[PDB]
Amino acid sequence: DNIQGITKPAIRRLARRGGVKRISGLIYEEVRAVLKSFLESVIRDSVTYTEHAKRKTVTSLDVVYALKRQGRTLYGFGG
Amino acid sequence: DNIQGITKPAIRRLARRGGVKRISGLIYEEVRAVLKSFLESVIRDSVTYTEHAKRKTVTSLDVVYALKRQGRTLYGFGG
Amino acid sequence: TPSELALYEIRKYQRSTDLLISKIPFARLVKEVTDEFTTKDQDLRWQSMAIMALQEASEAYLVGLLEHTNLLALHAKRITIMKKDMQLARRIRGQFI
Amino acid sequence: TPSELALYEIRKYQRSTDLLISKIPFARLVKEVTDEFTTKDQDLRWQSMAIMALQEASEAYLVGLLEHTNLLALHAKRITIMKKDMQLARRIRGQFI
Amino acid sequence: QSRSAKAGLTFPVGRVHRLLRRGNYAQRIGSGAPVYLTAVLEYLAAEILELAGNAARDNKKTRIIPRHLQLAIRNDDELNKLLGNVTIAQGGVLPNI
Amino acid sequence: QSRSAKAGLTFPVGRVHRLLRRGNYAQRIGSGAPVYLTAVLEYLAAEILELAGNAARDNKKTRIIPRHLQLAIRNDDELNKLLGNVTIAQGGVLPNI
Amino acid sequence: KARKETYSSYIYKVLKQTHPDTGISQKSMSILNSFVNDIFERIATEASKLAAYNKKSTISAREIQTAVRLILPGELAKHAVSEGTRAVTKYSSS
Amino acid sequence: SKARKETYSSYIYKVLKQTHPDTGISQKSMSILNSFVNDIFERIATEASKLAAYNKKSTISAREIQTAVRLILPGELAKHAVSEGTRAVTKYSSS
Numbered sequence: 001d002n003i004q005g006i007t008k009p010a011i012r013r014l015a016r017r018g019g020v021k022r023i024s025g026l027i028y029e030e031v032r033a034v035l036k037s038f039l040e041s042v043i044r045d046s047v048t049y050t051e052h053a054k055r056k057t058v059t060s061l062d063v064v065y066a067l068k069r070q071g072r073t074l075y076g077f078g079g
Numbered sequence: 080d081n082i083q084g085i086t087k088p089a090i091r092r093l094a095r096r097g098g099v100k101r102i103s104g105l106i107y108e109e110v111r112a113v114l115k116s117f118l119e120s121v122i123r124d125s126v127t128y129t130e131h132a133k134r135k136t137v138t139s140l141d142v143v144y145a146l147k148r149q150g151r152t153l154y155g156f157g158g
Numbered sequence: 159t160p161s162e163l164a165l166y167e168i169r170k171y172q173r174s175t176d177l178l179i180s181k182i183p184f185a186r187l188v189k190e191v192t193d194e195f196t197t198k199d200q201d202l203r204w205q206s207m208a209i210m211a212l213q214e215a216s217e218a219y220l221v222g223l224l225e226h227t228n229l230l231a232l233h234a235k236r237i238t239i240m241k242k243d244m245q246l247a248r249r250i251r252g253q254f255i
Numbered sequence: 256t257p258s259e260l261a262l263y264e265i266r267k268y269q270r271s272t273d274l275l276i277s278k279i280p281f282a283r284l285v286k287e288v289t290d291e292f293t294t295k296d297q298d299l300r301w302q303s304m305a306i307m308a309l310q311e312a313s314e315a316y317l318v319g320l321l322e323h324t325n326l327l328a329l330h331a332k333r334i335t336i337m338k339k340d341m342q343l344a345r346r347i348r349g350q351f352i
Numbered sequence: 353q354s355r356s357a358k359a360g361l362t363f364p365v366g367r368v369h370r371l372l373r374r375g376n377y378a379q380r381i382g383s384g385a386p387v388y389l390t391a392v393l394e395y396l397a398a399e400i401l402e403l404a405g406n407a408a409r410d411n412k413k414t415r416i417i418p419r420h421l422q423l424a425i426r427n428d429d430e431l432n433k434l435l436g437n438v439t440i441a442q443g444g445v446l447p448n449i
Numbered sequence: 450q451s452r453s454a455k456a457g458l459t460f461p462v463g464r465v466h467r468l469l470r471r472g473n474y475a476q477r478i479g480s481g482a483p484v485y486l487t488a489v490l491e492y493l494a495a496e497i498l499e500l501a502g503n504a505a506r507d508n509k510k511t512r513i514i515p516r517h518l519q520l521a522i523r524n525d526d527e528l529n530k531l532l533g534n535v536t537i538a539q540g541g542v543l544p545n546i
Numbered sequence: 547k548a549r550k551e552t553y554s555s556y557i558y559k560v561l562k563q564t565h566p567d568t569g570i571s572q573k574s575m576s577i578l579n580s581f582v583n584d585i586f587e588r589i590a591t592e593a594s595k596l597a598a599y600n601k602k603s604t605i606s607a608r609e610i611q612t613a614v615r616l617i618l619p620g621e622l623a624k625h626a627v628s629e630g631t632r633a634v635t636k637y638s639s640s
Numbered sequence: 641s642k643a644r645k646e647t648y649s650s651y652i653y654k655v656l657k658q659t660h661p662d663t664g665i666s667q668k669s670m671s672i673l674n675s676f677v678n679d680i681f682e683r684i685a686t687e688a689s690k691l692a693a694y695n696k697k698s699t700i701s702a703r704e705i706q707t708a709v710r711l712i713l714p715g716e717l718a719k720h721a722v723s724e725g726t727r728a729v730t731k732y733s734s735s
Contacts, residue, residue, distance in 0.1 A: 001190055005183030013178060015239075017171045018224030019545050021164060022237035027227075030241055034223065037254045038216055039191050045616065046212075047192065047202055052612035053600060056200065058192065060207035065599070067215045069616065073679070074215045076515065076538025076672045077207065081284040089277055093314075096268045096275065097321025098448050100261055101334045106324075109338055110317065116351040117316055121309065122288055124711065126299060131707040132695060136300035137289065142308040144694065148687075148711070149350075151316065155418065155441030155573050156308050158553075158580025175516035175541035218536035225545075226347065233330065233343075246330070250323065250347060252436070272419035272444040308441075315439045322448060359637045362556040362563075363582065371586070376473050376689070377594035377605055384607030384634050389589050391633030392614055392626040393582045397560050399622070400578060405565030415569025416561075421577055433619045438584075440577060456732045459651050459658075460677075468681065469700075473594070474689035479701030481729045486684060488728030489709050489721045490677045494648075495655050496717075498673060502660045512664040513656070518672055530714040539668055 003032045042066045082111045121145045177217050184216075185209050223248055274314050281313075282306050320345055365390045400425065418442045456484050460491040500525060515539040553579040589613050607634060648677050684708050702729055 008028045015023055043058075045066030050058045064079040073079065090107045094100075124145030129137045143157045171178060188209060192202050227244035231237060249255035268275060285306060289299050324341035328334060346352035356364035368386035403424035404416035411420055422443020425431060452462040466483040500521035501513045508517060519540025522528050557578045561570055570578075592613035593605040600609070607630075614626050652673045656663055665673075688708030689700045706725060710718045 002183055002187045005180065005187060007180075010180060013171065014220060015224055015228070016164070016168045017178070017221055017542065018228050019168060019172070020224075020228045020231070020237065020239060021161075021168075022231075022239075024238045024240050026241040027239050027244060030245065031220070034248060034254065035216060035220060036191075038219055039188060039212065040195060041254070042212060042215060043188065043191050043195060046208065047195065048612060048616055049599070050202065051200065052596065052609060057203035057205060058208055059205060060211050063208040063211040067211060070215075071534065072215060072219070073535055074211050074218070074538070075532075075535040075675055075679070076214075076540075076668060077211055077675075078671070079675050079679070081280065081287055084277075084280045085284065086277065086280075089275075089280075092268060092275060093317060094321060094325075095261070095265045096271075096445075097318050097325055098265060098269065099321065099325035099328065099334070099336060100265070101336075103335050103337045105338045106336050106341060109341065110321075113320065113345060113351065114313055114317060118285065118288060118309070118313060119292075120351070121312060122285070122292060125305070125309070126289060126292060127707065127711055128691070128694070129299060130297075131691060131703070135297065136302060137305045138302075139304045139308045140694070142305050142312070146308075146312050150437050151312060151439065152437065152584070153308060153312055153315070153439055153441055154580050154584075155577045156304075156580070158576040158578070158583060169544065172544050173541060175514070175519060175539050177539075214536065214538060218542075221542055229347075230330075233327075250326075266447070269447050270444065272417075272422075272442060274442075311441050312439075315445075318445060353640070358640055359633070361633055361637070362560045363553060364556070365637070367551070368586070372590060372593075372605065375590055375594075375693075376475065377590045378473065378597045378603060380604035382605045382607055384637075385593065385605040385610045387637040388607045388630040388634050389586065389610055389614075391630045392589070393585055394560060394633075395626055395629040396585060396622070397557060397578060397582060398564055400581065401557075401561045401564045404561065404570065404574070405568045408565070408568045414567060415571055416574050417571050418574050418577060421574050430619045430621045434617070434622065442573060452732075455735045456728055458728060459655050460648065461651065464646075465681070469685060472682070472685055473598075474685045475692055475698070475700035477699040479699055479704075481702035481733070482688075482700055482705045484732050485702050485705045485725040485729045486681065486709075488725045489684070489705075490680055491651075491655070492721055492724045493680055493717070494652060494673060494677055495659065496720075497676065498652065498656050499659045501669070502656065502663050505663065511662055512666055513669045514666045515668045515672055518669055527714045527716045531717060538672060 003036060006032055006035060042070055045069050082115060085111055085114070121149065121151075124148060177213055179213065179217065184213055188212055223251065226251060274310055276310065276314065281310055285309055320348065323348060359387050359390065361387065361390050361394055363390050363394060399428070399431070403428065419444060422446070452484070453487075456488070458484070458487055458491055460487045460494075462487045465490070497522065497528065500528075516541055553582050557582065585617075588617055592617060647674055649674055683712060687712055 011028055011031050012023060042063070046058045046062040049062035049065055050056070060077055064074055064077060067074045068079070087107045090110050091102070093110070094102045121142065125137055125141040128141035128144050129135060132138070132141065139156050143153055146153045189204060192204065196202055223244070227239045227247040230243050230247040231239040234243060245255070286301060289301065293299055324336045324344040327340050327344040328336040331340060342352070354366070356366045359365040365387045368390050369381055369383070372381040372386055400421070404421065407420035407424050408414055408416050418440060419442070422440040423446055425435060425440065426446040453460060456462055462484050465487040469478055469483055497518070498513065501517045504517040504521045505511065505513055515537055516539065519537035520543070522532055522535070522537065523543045554575045557575060558570060561568060589610055593610045596609045596613060597603070597605055602609070611627060611630065614630065615623055618626055649670050652670065653665060656665060684705065688704045691708055692700045692704050706722055709721050709725065713721050
């Protein structure tokens with residue numbers, strides 16, 4: 001629906017940051033696959049956090065929290 | 080030369096549990112090296128646990144706490 | 159110069175300190191992912207700040223995996239990455255595969 | 256049969272449930288590693304049981320890294336592992352490199 | 353009558369309650385928390401132990417052993433996510449093909 | 450006279466004390482523990498911000514920014530072990546050469 | 547008679563109800579005991595965490611319900627939530 | 641309403657004045673360094689009191705904190721950290 005919004009030139013630019021200088025196609029659609037997996041996992045964690053807080057605004061507190069839970073502590077925004 | 084006393088037929092049969100059958104010679108020296116590195120760190124953690132515990136005999140609970148902190152937690156011993 | 163321009167381009171977004179994915183796309187993407195994960199009745203709001211942190215974690219992981227997948231392609235004596243190549247790189251890293 | 260015998264050998268120590276490193280060697284190895292890590296005055300004893308757990312962790316990690324390094328060699332379209340190959344496999348796994 | 357008896361759970365929920373007390377998890381320990389988590393733990397143990405029963409059946413050894421435990425827990429795909437970094441003592445590793 | 454002043458520390462030893470009380474780690478707290486912890490935290494903060502200031506000198510500007518911080522933390526190979534899991538906000542990523 | 551405690555006997559009778567004929571080696575029993583200990587530690591650390599997060603003095607059955615939902619993969623999570631709710635209801639009896 | 645939020649930003653800025661008197665700090669950098677000390681505080685204190693529980697001793701104390709820091713820090717930084725903790729607590733006890 002909008003995973004295509006993460007588009008092939010955009011992931012090309014990501015891969016320029018990655019240091020590549022040749023990239024085939026199917027790389028692209030599966031980069032969308034891995035991004036889907038990452039987003040849904042962390043989103044589920046933050047969602048569970050807020051809904052246990054009986055709130056309905058998943059919040060950066062719960063996002064940095066879900067990230068630390070996933071094992072990677074994004075860092076700079078409180079936390 | 081205790082790490083050389085860790086014999087090359089030994090490293091070979093370990094490779095064969097590892098599922099490989101052909102291994103270069105310097106793999107034996109550098110598998111000795113990786114064993115050395117992991118042993119060094121886990122020994123650091125367990126020895127320091129032991130030192131703090133005041134029972135200066137290195138204990139299985141010290142070893143398993145070392146592995147646990149390392150993320151390499153091992154079962155059957157802390158139980 | 160194709161190579162000179164593209165390599166210079168690597169360096170400038172390599173040392174650029176900031177996120178680089180398209181933003182309204184990413185925000186609506188997380189919004190619809192929450193909407194589909196969430197159900198009929200309970201719906202969840204998102205402020206600027208959660209969307210922020212989600213973005214930075216996604217950027218950082220995909221760039222890390224990106225050097226690793228680039229490197230598995232380098233190990234194939236080539237400079238294209240493929241499905242199998244990266245698929246593997248990630249899966250060797252273990253999580254989510 | 257070289258291949259038949261050696262593959263059968265893989266399977267039998269693959270499904271063998273037990274540790275397989277030489278024991279008096281491993282024990283004196285940990286003993287001297289503790290001795291060199293420890294100093295002049297404070298010396299540390301080891302019972303059977305700590306040596307046990309150390310052994311099993313070492314076995315398990317090296318066998319895990321072993322399938323991974325075997326696999327990086329498989330990815331090189333070969334079946335020897337080398338320094339660079341494994342060196343990398345481990346280092347891609349991250350810790351201790 | 354006993355709290356551990358009326359719980360209808362094998363593991364004594366009184367022990368779990370006082371473990372939570374000394375575990376410093378919070379200042380007050382809700383009485384439903386230890387019984388609930390004791391039941392969750394009992395179900396997980398039931399998973400491991402019905403795997404133990406069927407592994408004893410398959411391997412013909414009536415009493416479960418660590419080899420069978422490691423094989424079954426490594427075959428349990430969903431559970432390995434919980435026990436990914438985890439490793440089992442004297443269990444070897446499941447055969448790779 | 451304040452506890453931080455009596456210690457020669459800049460950081461709030463009293464705040465570390467009360468936070469240890471809030472963090473429910475243990476019921477009895479040695480009086481030397483909060484001051485020791487505050488000293489450790491002050492040392493680490495001073496080291497990282499000095500590295501960031503030298504990075505700013507390298508970038509020829511007189512204000513610290515997250516890029517300076519990210520460059521310093523990634524370049525220092527010991528603090529990169531200490532914060533290997535962290536990714537910095539607007540911090541970027543380090544070049545290949 | 548200074549006795550010593552463990553989960554071994556309770557785990558043993560759990561195995562009896564699952565499969566009364568099947569036995570268990572003592573080291574496999576230790577694996578199970580350390581398994582229950584590790585999952586208890588995980589859920590209880592999550593409980594302390596969530597309590598500090600909601601600034602609540604106590605551990606609630608519902609906040610550890612949430613902790614189980616965080617920690618367990620979906621299949622084991624649904625089974626565990628059902629089992630724990632059932633056990634709470636049956637423990638409430640007297 | 642909005643409650644007063646805990647921060648170490650004043651102390652961070654003061655130590656930067658001691659180090660480089662002419663240097664300022666960006667807001668994002670300041671939030672980053674404010675998060676540094678809390679993250680470290682947690683990952684020291686939890687490990688230290690867990691080690692105390694392993695001792696089966698009631699009190700979290702200076703020896704426990706020293707051991708926890710020297711466990712979790714990489715060694716090169718750990719030497720400096722333990723030396724500075726020891727000298728700081730000694731200077732305090734000398735009061």
